[PDB]
Amino acid sequence: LEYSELYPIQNEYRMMQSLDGMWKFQFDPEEIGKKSGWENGLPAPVSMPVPSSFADFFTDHKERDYCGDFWYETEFYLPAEWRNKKIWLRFGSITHRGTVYCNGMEITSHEGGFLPVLADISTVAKPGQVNQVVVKINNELNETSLPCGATKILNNGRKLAKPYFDFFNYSGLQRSVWVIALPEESVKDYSVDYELCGTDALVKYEVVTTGEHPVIVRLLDAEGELVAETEGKEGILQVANARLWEVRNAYLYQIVILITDGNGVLDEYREKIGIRTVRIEGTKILLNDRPVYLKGFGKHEDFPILGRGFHWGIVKRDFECLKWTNANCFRTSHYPYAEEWYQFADEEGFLIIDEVPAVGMMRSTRNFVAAGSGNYTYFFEALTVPELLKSHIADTEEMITRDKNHPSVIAWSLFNEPETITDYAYEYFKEVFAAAETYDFQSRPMTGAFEKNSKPELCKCYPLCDFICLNRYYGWYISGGPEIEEAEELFRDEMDRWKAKELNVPFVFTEFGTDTMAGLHKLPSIMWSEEYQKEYLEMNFRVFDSYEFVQGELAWNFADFQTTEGIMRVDGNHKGVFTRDRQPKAAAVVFKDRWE
Amino acid sequence: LEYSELYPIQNEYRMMQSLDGMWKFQFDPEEIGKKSGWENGLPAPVSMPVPSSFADFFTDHKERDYCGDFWYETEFYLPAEWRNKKIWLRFGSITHRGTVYCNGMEITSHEGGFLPVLADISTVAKPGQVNQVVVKINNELNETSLPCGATKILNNGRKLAKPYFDFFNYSGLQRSVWVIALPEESVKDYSVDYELCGTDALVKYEVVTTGEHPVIVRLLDAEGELVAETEGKEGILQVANARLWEVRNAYLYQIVILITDGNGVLDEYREKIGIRTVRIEGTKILLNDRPVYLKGFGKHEDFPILGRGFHWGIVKRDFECLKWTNANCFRTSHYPYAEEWYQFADEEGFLIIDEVPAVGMMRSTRNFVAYFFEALTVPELLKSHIADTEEMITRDKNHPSVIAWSLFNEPETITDYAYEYFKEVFAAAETYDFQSRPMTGAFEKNSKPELCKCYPLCDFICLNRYYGWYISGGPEIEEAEELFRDEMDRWKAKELNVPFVFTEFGTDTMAGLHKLPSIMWSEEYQKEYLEMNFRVFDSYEFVQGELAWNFADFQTTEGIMRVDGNHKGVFTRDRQPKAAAVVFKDRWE
């Protein structure tokens, strides 16, 4: 990467100033902004909170559902004392793609809506003056970038996003924005990897800087005491009597990376890390050499009004709920979350399966969204797939570079419900997995979540995985309700087929659930009732517990969340175990009791 | 005040750095923190978001309902360049009262949970180093500070807040926290007042600085062009062809206040202001010399999970909803809101009645929960009330949106004791408001026209009435209407020649509860109740505003009369319209 993914810090060498607040915002349905000079200021803006998704503020459909180009603008005073620094705009994300301007000048563009965008404004920044940032953003969906979908043009020319995925197309500036100042020679990246040696541990590391001066690396314990120190851009820190980062029992050291010229220090980067190992051994997931059974949820970045907008309050409530259920794990379904989620998981000892936004790659869904009105003959995969692969690999590189040093991150999920039953899909995913392994200094477990279409007899992609994640809805989409006994039979039949393959890898259920409307009670239960959610879960548990190789269960979903409206979604997806405002349905206690 | 209320800005002379984020937090049930060195760091903290109310994060009752002392801590790196600036911690608020420590040193304490707390850390700050802030906060309720209530001790020593007010006792660090740097000689306060002269306007001003150097004041238009400039700490800016700030049609100038040393500038303060006048003339409320009828709501700072935690997203959605209803006004029931609400109202052309947290001043409700103004604690309560009033007015006076001060909500007013008490509050408010804009308060039904001693203090009279809810509801709604008209006929007979505004009326309404014929609590009854109230309002010429209770469902103390908070919202807590929202939209159009 031609920029650093490192989270920004404030110290003697590095400065940061938040640009969060009310920005100026303007929709550009006619796509006239750039030729009209909007990069120098929006002509008729409204106010827009940052961070937030824009959609749910408005009271009219066309603004909520807006699809196309739209622009953000703000101004900030740059301290004069930042003069002799490399000055960057850092967006937590720009959803889905955008071009950043500063003081009227084009700085950078980015594709991918869920990872940081770094824009080097050093050459146009005006220290000791007010500066301007303008961002052109686009939220259309296509088949050459993630997540996948289509864009429909309505009779009036109005665009409408048509996802191939089951979540609302929230977009905008959904995460915090900073302007930061770095030393001219700085720490750009580092990687740690761990080895356990009895009571001791080794922290292997690499550091990438933007210069040639010597590097010193120190490790401090949770009290700030020096426990190890070495020199060089590559090395090993030896930690006596190491306090390991444990599941639901975190311990964090602080790594301190210094660039020196002998006379003094040029840069200092510090970050909390946790000494822990993760590996797959047969059907076991080993954390610090001991098996762990994953218990938790797929989540979303989703909350009323804010949409995917980041807020520490959502983090705090969600973790309190997670702990109350006795969970130990979540998957970042279906995109990398704001960095703060991982920082907090590190502190709380939660395990994370970190997922790239490779969702929407199922052919039947694509075809369905094309058949709506209307198309049944024209598709061009041969042309788009190579471009999609490039985008997928780029997002993977960005995710892993951003997240690798979190002790919480124990696995990469490289897809959710793609086509996997052709040799072509194998060749596609082989490249993604190869890239992931190359970018991950730890070479930690890699996986993806498979839809039921990936039958054990047909799937060509599970051998790429270190463990296999299954999304299954036996008792919801398949043989629901009065047919639930048949659902259980079908589920056991499938798992018997997996069993007979004797793959000797762990299986984790990454999704299972039922839409459940809080307050819908029925005796006997019906699909959509709270009681049916409980019974469905009990049936699933009986199945899970029948197979030795099943080593985790992440329910879909932690909480009800927003989707595109339609005949199958009653104000979003109601498969939450909690409501959207984070309160438990009856099924939450079922998990609490089982996971205790 | 021995600190500035001015909103922090970043320029050549002034710096600011946000301390928002995850803070360290610890409950102190045994009240031993200050005995045990907690001001130097909390011994066993958990993480707590700031800004937010703490209560709704937790999954256990005792943490949610915690009442007593509790502590916050964070660390921040102070840029070396801030050396020899006056360095302050600025808390948007500390709810309800607290003591601020920095680097282990006690800095200041504050009583009052809804206005800024400024702590001068100049003498203990360590530029170019990590610094520490620790805050001891207390959220108990008493009868000597606002808002009023009691604190109960359960047989195991556990405290429980017992409000005399109908909102949940949210507390903590509910607004953003900044550390800021100011010049040694700085602009501490300023005030503007307006006069309309045909197509022109005068902006009268006063500036208070911390030194003796000359001051220059400039006024820029919305494009940044200079339209007026004058010298002196007191003066008049003459604006040719002034673009007035109008209801639902704002225009904002920027005032620029410079302290000069002859060849250089020592400080610069800038803020957006709007040229507008407000006055009460007979039974009319005049905005820029034209009558305006107030249409809108009482609100709260209240949202799921965050509690009273400030977020611009809540502001944006709420204003979009307000505009969709064709409202023009809200009251900051029952405490000053985060400053950002007023900044936004200024931009959107909304009118605000700014209310100090003088709620819970009732003897009935006090006596039940636990002669209010006859209690020996009263002299102390008065001091607290006046202090909060001074702070509110000093903070908010320069917002064009703020057109009135509400100095109480539902106190006792029917004795001479109450009159003497409020006379002092109103006199103080008048001294603090450079504009002398209208002062009022919201009266409960117990303040009968024959008995109330306090309405004469008010420039206009605000009534909270629940004829058709607490009085003769449901099958008795026709009786309710008669009783309402009887009361209003009694007010009319006084011939006071002042405007009346209804600052509350509403019905608890469960979203989705439908009934034909309607019942109390149904969406249909909310509509019928409102229609009845409108008929009454429209029968009296002197009624010049209606602010419904409430904009949105909001959190209260648990109890047999509150079904997950107060459901008198016209919108749900997540800001979606009940059937009644359309009724307001159509009427207010």
Ligand SMILES: O=C(O)[C@H]1CNC[C@@H](O)[C@@H]1O
């Ligand atoms: O249909 C569902 O509820 C789920 C199916 N698997 C993918 C999820 O994104 C989706 O939400």
Ligand SMILES: O=C(O)[C@H]1CNC[C@@H](O)[C@@H]1O
């Ligand atoms: O009872 C009610 O609904 C209201 C009565 N007047 C005061 C409000 O705070 C309260 O919420």
